[PDB]
Amino acid sequence: SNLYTERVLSVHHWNDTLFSFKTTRNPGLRFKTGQFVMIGLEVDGRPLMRAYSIASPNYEEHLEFFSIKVPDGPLTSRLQHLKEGDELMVSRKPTGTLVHDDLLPGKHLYLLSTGTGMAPFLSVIQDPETYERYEKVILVHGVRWVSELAYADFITKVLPEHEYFGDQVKEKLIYYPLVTREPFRNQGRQTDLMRSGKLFEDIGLPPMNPQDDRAMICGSPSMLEETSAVLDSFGLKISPRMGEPGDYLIERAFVEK
């Protein structure tokens, strides 16, 4: 059918509610950094499909997904059991609002995420175009528990040594993990820390302004609303719709069903 059937190459569990996996990628699946695609499994005679951000670089011939594990979630109660060699259905045309083209030129790119909302941003931080367009890239990953800080080693130790753009990562990428419920070097919610100015002080950058700062926001619908309001308070204006460049972009990491 119009769905690709890919094969699982590797799986890694981060904790009780998070895991990632890599699959083969059909050469016909083209995507812009930041986009999502429908993926799923055949259940009771029908594909059980859900939107997933593509977490792998768009120039590499494989796909990677960073996923939640919902106890009785229709798709993830099954997806959590993926093993090497298993089949995964993937749709043909990715889409989404978190693309480079919809941000006006600027100096800093803030990637504001909570939970699995960091997924599209994993693609962004591995995209040479990101470093071509910005002086600084700030990946904020807000979670509740330290164990939810998936990809910590990749972001802080592996990516900076990248053979082709590791030096750009060292010079430009700032990683600001945040944890609310356990002791952690950076405590709190990113929205609160931005409103007080503490987030910027911690990372060594000036407060945001509409001329220099751009952002992509990915988290729960409530998180998007609250974070959008914070950026609006600094004078930034959201892209009004896909295709119309603005100061920041937003996309729901999931929906409360």
Ligand SMILES: Cc1cc2nc3c(=O)[nH]c(=O)nc-3n(C[C@H](O)[C@H](O)[C@H](O)COP(=O)(O)OP(=O)(O)OC[C@H]3O[C@@H](n4cnc5c(N)ncnc54)[C@H](O)[C@@H]3O)c2cc1C
């Ligand atoms: C544009 C878009 C991109 C998405 N990208 C991803 C992604 O990269 N990774 C991913 O894991 N999910 C992502 N999601 C959510 C995903 O589509 C499914 O909701 C997820 O795979 C759970 O399916 P389910 O069938 O198990 O549970 P569902 O019935 O879908 O959802 C059950 C409940 O789980 C919670 N839930 C679902 N997904 C999440 C989540 N990711 N984090 C926290 N709580 C959640 C909610 O309380 C929800 O009501 C995305 C959603 C959208 C709209």
